[PDB]
Amino acid sequence: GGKKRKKKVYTTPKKIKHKHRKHKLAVLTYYKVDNEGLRRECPAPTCGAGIFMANMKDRQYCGKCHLTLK
Amino acid sequence: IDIAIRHVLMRQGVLGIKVKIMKDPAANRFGPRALPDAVKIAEAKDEDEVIPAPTVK
RNA sequence: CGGCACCUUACGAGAAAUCAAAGUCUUUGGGUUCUGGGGGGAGUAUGGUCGCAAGGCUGAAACUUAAAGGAAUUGACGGAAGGGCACCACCAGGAGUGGAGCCUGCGGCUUAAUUUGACUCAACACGGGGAAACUCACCAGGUCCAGACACAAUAAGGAUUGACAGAUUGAGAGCUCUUUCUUGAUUUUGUGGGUGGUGGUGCAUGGCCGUUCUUAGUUGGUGGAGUGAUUUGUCUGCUUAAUUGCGAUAACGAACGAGACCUUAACCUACUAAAUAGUGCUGCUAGCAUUUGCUGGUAUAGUCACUUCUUAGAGGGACUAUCGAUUUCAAGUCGAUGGAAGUUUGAGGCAAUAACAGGUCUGUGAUGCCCUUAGACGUUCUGGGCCGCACGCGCGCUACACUGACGGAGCCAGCGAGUAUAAGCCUUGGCCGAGAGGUCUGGGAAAUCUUGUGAAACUCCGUCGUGCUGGGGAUAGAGCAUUGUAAUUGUUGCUCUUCAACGAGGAAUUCCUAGUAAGCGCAAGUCAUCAGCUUGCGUUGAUUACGUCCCUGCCCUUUGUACACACCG
């Protein structure tokens, strides 16, 4: 019966998949409100306000959409 | 002849059922009403009372 | 009176075959002798006894074993008899195949994989199986859950959904990573429970198909026979394609199959109508001839006629009609005359009962069970394989030449198919290129156009002139295109060149009886491309029977059987 389809061998390791980075109040690491007193709100009109950016290796990018420059 | 065939899904497997019915040709409306080799010679009304030279008028 | 026997019946007997004794025997008893007590071991061993011997007579046990055996029934089988039938059988021939190159399927070897089913007819151009991707089930590698649902964990201080730069990858898969930009309860983790599977099992099944078997066969009611399994009906004779009829009869009346039936081919100047068919007439014309003629062209207005041709509906037509002969004079059979039709008029679809461990789980959201289900045997993506080649076999195509190759000329069928915001259908005309092919228009959802599918064999007139030669067109290089995302392992088409086997095929073996074989193309299916394949269609069109049981088989009867897994016993 199709030579009784056997076990199959592996040359690659089982790839542990991706995990979501459980952050601790990212709002508390964007905003800096001290006594009586934040990257950019995605210049595109797709959002208006409510979009922040993470700066690394010369990258200002948007997540609820995708603009990026420099 | 009318045939209906069904697959009866039992617990151990599938049963199959066939039902043929040979309806009488008399009830057939839009087709033949008898078998091909059915022949329907009828009786006679030949017998009657006669007389050699009558002319009634 | 005694004998040797025989015939009929079944009194009565018997398990029956059969028996006038094998009767007068559970209603058991005339007299008397011998023998047997499941099958083997075994008529063996031993002792005795007779024999010249060969051997005879008498004659155990251990041990072994579930049947051995009798008569009859149904079937099957016979190198048994009788009667029939068949080009999947022969006769008599034709075309061949088997020999060659190549196409293609099977095996084997190879391989990472060369996926798999089927193995006499009834596997092997079969799975509608002509696979570049897809198909796809195989191999190497990468992703997705498309895991519904109930709980439990978790969580809006975030269950988790994604996606930029580089790394990474076969790859512009956030597959995975430094990188945290976005999402908010749709989802992740665990149990239970699902779902899908071209994974297994066709020897667990449904349905379908093939075969037994393209033959004439099959069955019950009541009656008759038999203790019964069963049997007769269902048959001696003749006749037929035929268990189909004439008939015969312990049957009688039935039923299925066969036949009827349905589709199609052949005939109709006899009805009905054709602007999607045709023929004419009559206009407006052209070439010839001028006799008003011969050839054609055009007019879906000429407000023309009609139905031979063609189309399709309503019918008719063969029933063996008439006649001559043989036959139980019966069912039939052989010849003529008439006729389109005289094998069942030709050709098919449909097609009983009983079966096969025939094929298919790889057609199926047809399926039970087993397996598997997240690093998946689900699905999807990239690439390869199914094409791999010391070799064996089947279905084929092209050939081995002059009844021939070419080169011009003649240009004669029939069955069908076709689309429109395509991803494009049949494609006409016009124009380019040698050709393949390209482009601009036009017609056709079609008796309207493609299309008269001007098909190919075939006919004529020329070149070749007996030879592997202008026969044959393998293998191979260069080039031009086309389909497709992708032609390398040449997809296919065209041009130049290369010019291989093969000179008619061994032992073997297939198909076929008239518009048949053989030849020859054509269309449709598969289809983006590709037909040496099937399913149909027409064109040309034969030799030889019109019989037989020698071979291979099939049907019926008789007969034998120690067979019933049925002689492959």
Give which of A50, A43, A51, A32 is closest to A67, Cα–Cα. A43
d(CA B40, CA B57): 39
Interatomic CA–C1' length for residue B18 and nucleotide C195, angstroms: 33
SS3 letters for B1-48? Answer: CEEEEEEEECCCCEEEEEEEECCCHHHCCCCCCCCCCCCCCCCCCCCC
Place of tokens 């690659």: A12
3-state secondary structure of A46: coil
Q: Is A20 exposed, middle or buried (0-12, 13-18, 19+ CB in 10 A)?
A: exposed
Q: Is A11 exposed, middle or buried (0-12, 13-18, 19+ CB in 10 A)?
A: exposed
Interatomic CA–C1' length for residue B5 and nucleotide C433, angstroms: 65
State both tokens at A28: 């508390």
State both tokens at A51: 């979009």
Q: How far is CA A4 from CA A1, A7, A8, A9, A53, in A?
A: 6, 10, 12, 16, 56
Residue numbers in the known binding site of A for Zn(2+) are: 42, 47, 62, 65
Query: Could you tell me the sign of the dihedral formed by the alpha carbons of A30, A34, A40, A45, in that order?
Result: positive
Q: How far is CA A30 from CA A6, A25, B33, B40, in A?
A: 55, 9, 93, 104
Technique employed here was: cryo-EM
Q: Is A64 exposed, middle or buried (0-12, 13-18, 19+ CB in 10 A)?
A: exposed
Resolution for this experimental structure (Å): 2.3
Report whether A67 contacts A43 (CB < 8 A).
Answer: yes
Residue numbers in the known binding site of A are: 42, 47, 62, 65
Place of tokens 């934040």: A38
d(CA A63, CA A54): 10
Q: Residue type at B40?
A: K
State both tokens at A22: 């459980």
User: Taking the mean position of all CA atoms in its chain, how far away is CA A44?
Assistant: 19
